[PDB]
């Protein structure tokens, strides 16, 4: 058993997802403002088991996001179908490599950290519904998912 | 006074508050209780289930708790389901586990009436659901034409070869579709290269079947959904196997070709230079010990990490 092998997989895969997200159109404006920010615990140092769950949770939520009506964006459906699938592939992969171990995930689900991460993503899904899934809302979400993928990349250092 | 929460229903439509933040209630006893996060006290209502029958199969269409709501709106991928099937009068229940929102129960007897029960489980957040109200359905009489059998997909990278045993139509569905919540699924995508084929040989390119993972379909009912992952994984290289034939035990050492070798899982494939049967076992560490082998006989070992044939003759007995 080792986390170093999982570090090599999540790095290879977030690159596969970040490329797919980039291919939606061609311009990601990181200054696209919206009041919701990734929880402070994610940027901060966290446990070895807790990271793998944080990744899974983020990929599960990023999946749930792209399921919504993206009709207003004029993005290529083919690429969004492709993205959801590569996202879901890893979501299934992470859950299976944390199958034999069962105690620490329960501790992680009752954590204030996980709750804060889920509170954050609730605000992301709520935002899109309020703005009635128009282009500006998605332009903001794409930029946020980019920033999120970088956080997934920052978290992979916590495995070594 | 206590508050009971069953999904998005409370006890003492389009606009609702955050289920993960601090929330409170005031009713006018002068109600003002302990502030809590609703996500911990909320119960799971049974999943909605609709049955559909065929000759030798039953389709169980599972809808997750909430239509769709907010309490489980972000928990949907976490949920797993357990199905219980039996004939109407029987007491022995067959158990099938599923993550899929449509689980086809096969190998069933035609014109027989079976009853179903679906449980929604949250395998990570401790919680579970009370089984759904029992639902019964009867199978139809066997079709004049049977559905295709064993499927195998051998791919040459950019082209896929679909080999099977028996006009034939084929449909493809992306991997995440059968696994993620319905309401919008499962609309199967078509295949022009295999829509009305004359042969069992089916060839299709990556342009049409664009997802990394997908399911395949093969008036007759639909065949078993064949799931195939298309990944350019030419990793890792074979390990270096070492055999030490001792008096009795035949010690086998698996060495990974990228060290440190601290946390790894190993597999063994051993046989005899006269038999055409392969025996296989997996251990925690790399030190495999082949015990109770016939003496003065040649044994061929092979290994993989999670090798080429290496034949060694045993010892007589000192």
UniProtKB/Swiss-Prot annotation, chain A:
CDD domains: IFab
Presence of the UniProt keyword Cytoplasm in the record: no
Keywords: Antiviral defense, Cytokine, Disulfide bond, Glycoprotein, Phosphoprotein, Secreted, Signal
Phenotype of the disrupted gene, per the record: Mice show impaired antiviral activity and are highly susceptible to vaccinia virus infection. Mice show spontaneous neurodegeneration: mice display motor and cognitive learning impairments associated with alpha-synuclein-containing Lewy bodies in the brain, as well as a reduction in dopaminergic neurons and defective dopamine signaling in the nigrostriatal region. Mice also show defects in adaptive immunity: bone marrow cells display B-cells maturation defects, and bone marrow macrophages show impaired myelopoiesis and lipopolysaccharide (LPS)-inducible production of tumor necrosis factor.
Subcellular location: Secreted
Superkingdom field: Eukaryota
PTMs per UniProt: This beta interferon does not have a disulfide bond.
Family of the protein in this entry: Belongs to the alpha/beta interferon family.
Free-text function comment from the UniProt entry: Type I interferon cytokine that plays a key role in the innate immune response to infection, developing tumors and other inflammatory stimuli. Signals via binding to high-affinity (IFNAR2) and low-affinity (IFNAR1) heterodimeric receptor, activating the canonical Jak-STAT signaling pathway resulting in transcriptional activation or repression of interferon-regulated genes that encode the effectors of the interferon response, such as antiviral proteins, regulators of cell proliferation and differentiation, and immunoregulatory proteins.
Record-given protein name: Interferon beta
UniProtKB/Swiss-Prot annotation, chain B:
Gene Ontology CC, one term: lysosome
Disruption phenotype: Mice are protected from the lethal septic effects of intraperitoneal LPS administration observed in wild-type mice. Double knockout with TREX1 does not show a visible phenotype.
Principal cellular location given in the protein's record: membrane
Keywords for the protein's UniProt record, in alphabetical order: Cell membrane, Disulfide bond, Endosome, Glycoprotein, Isopeptide bond, Lysosome, Membrane, Phosphoprotein, Receptor, Repeat, Signal, Transmembrane, Transmembrane helix, Ubl conjugation
Top-rank lineage group of the source organism: Eukaryota
Membrane topology: Single-pass type I membrane protein
Residues of the Fibronectin type-III domain: 43-142, 146-230, 235-317
Annotated localization: Cell membrane; Late endosome; Lysosome
GO BP of this protein: cellular response to interferon-alpha; defense response to virus; gene expression; positive regulation of DNA-templated transcription; positive regulation of interferon-beta production; positive regulation of interleukin-1 beta production; positive regulation of type II interferon production; response to lipopolysaccharide
PTM note: Ubiquitinated. This leads to its internalization and lysosomal degradation. The 'Lys-63'-linked ubiquitin chains are cleaved off by the BRISC complex; this prevents receptor internalization and degradation. Probable ubiquitination sites have been identified in human, but are poorly conserved across species. Phosphorylated on serine residues in response to interferon binding; this promotes interaction with FBXW11 and ubiquitination.
Bridged cysteine pairs (disulfide): 115-136, 194-202, 300-311
Glycosylation sites: 9, 97, 130, 273
Positions in the Extracellular compartment: 1-318
Gene Ontology molecular function, alphabetical: interferon receptor activity; type I interferon binding; type I interferon receptor activity
Note from the entry: The interferon signaling pathway is not identical between species. Thus, the interaction with STAT1 and STAT2 may not be conserved in mouse; in human it requires phosphorylation at 'Tyr-466', but the mouse protein has a Phe at the equivalent position. Likewise, cysteine palmitoylation is required for the activation of STAT1 and STAT2 in human, but the Cys is not conserved in mouse.
Subunit architecture: Heterodimer with IFNAR2; forming the receptor for type I interferon. Interacts with TYK2. Interacts with STAT1 and STAT2. Interacts (serine-phosphorylated form) with FBXW11, the substrate recognition component of a SCF (SKP1-CUL1-F-box protein) E3 ubiquitin-protein ligase complex. 3Interacts with SHMT2; this promotes interaction with ABRAXAS2 and the BRISC complex. Interacts with TRIM10; this interaction prevents association between IFNAR1 and TYK2.
Family (UniProt): Belongs to the type II cytokine receptor family.
Name of the protein described by the UniProt record: Interferon alpha/beta receptor 1
Species of the source: Mus musculus (Mouse)
Species lineage: Eukaryota, Metazoa, Chordata, Craniata, Vertebrata
Gene name tied to this protein: Ifnar1
Parent sequence residues shown: 35 to 426 of 590
């Amino acid at each position: 058993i080792n986390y170093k092998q999982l570090q090599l997989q999540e790095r290879t895969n977030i690159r596969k997802c970040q490329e797919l997200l980039e291919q939606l159109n061609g311009k990601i404006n990181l200054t696209y403002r919206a009041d919701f920010k990734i929880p402070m615990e994610m940027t901060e140092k966290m446990q070895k088991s807790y990271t793998a769950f944080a990744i899974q949770e983020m990929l599960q939520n990023v999946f749930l996001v792209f399921r919504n009506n993206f009709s207003s964006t004029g993005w290529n459906e083919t690429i969004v179908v492709r993205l959801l699938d590569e996202l879901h592939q890893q979501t299934v992969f992470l859950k299976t490599v944390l199958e034999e171990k069962q105690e620490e995930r329960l501790t992680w689900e009752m954590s204030s950290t996980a709750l804060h991460l889920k509170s954050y993503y609730w605000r992301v899904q709520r935002y899109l519904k309020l703005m009635k899934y128009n282009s500006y809302a998605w332009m903001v979400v794409r930029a946020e998912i980019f920033r999120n993928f970088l956080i997934i990349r920052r978290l992979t250092r916590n495995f070594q | 006074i206590d508050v009971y929460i069953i999904d998005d229903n409370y006890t003492l439509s389009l606009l609702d508050t955050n289920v993960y933040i601090k929330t409170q209630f005031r009713v006018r006893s002068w109600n003002e209780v302990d502030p809590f996060i609703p996500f911990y006290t909320a119960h799971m209502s049974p999943p909605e289930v609709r049955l559909e029958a065929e000759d030798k199969a039953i389709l169980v269409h599972i809808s997750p708790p909430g239509q769709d709501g907010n309490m489980w709106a972000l928990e949907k991928p976490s949920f797993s389901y357990t199905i219980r099937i039996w004939q109407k009068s029987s007491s022995d229940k067959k158990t099938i586990n599923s993550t899929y929102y449509v689980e086809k129960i096969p190998e069933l007897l035609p014109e027989t009436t079976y009853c179903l029960e679906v449980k929604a489980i949250h395998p990570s957040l401790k919680k579970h659901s009370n089984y759904s109200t029992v639902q019964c359905i009867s199978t139809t009489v066997a079709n004049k034409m049977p559905v295709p059998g064993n499927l195998q997909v051998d791919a040459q990278g950019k082209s896929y070869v679909l080999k099977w045993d028996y006009l034939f139509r084929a449909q493809w569905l992306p991997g995440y579709s059968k696994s993620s919540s319905g309401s919008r699924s499962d609309k199967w995508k078509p295949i022009p290269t295999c829509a009305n084929v004359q042969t069992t040989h089916c060839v299709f390119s990556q342009d049409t079947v664009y997802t990394g993972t997908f399911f395949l379909h093969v008036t007759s009912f639909w065949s078993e959904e064949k799931f195939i992952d298309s990944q350019k994984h030419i990793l890792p290289p074979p390990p270096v196997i070492t055999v030490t034939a001792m008096s009795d035990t035949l010690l086998v050492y698996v060495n990974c070709q990228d060290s440190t070798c601290d946390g790894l899982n190993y597999e063994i494939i051993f046989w005899e230079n006269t038999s055409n049967t392969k025996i296989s076992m997996e251990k925690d560490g790399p030190e495999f010990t082949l015990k109770n082998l016939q003496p003065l006989t040649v044994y061929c070992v092979q290994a993989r990490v999670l090798s080429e044939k290496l034949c060694e003759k045993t010892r007589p007995g000192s």
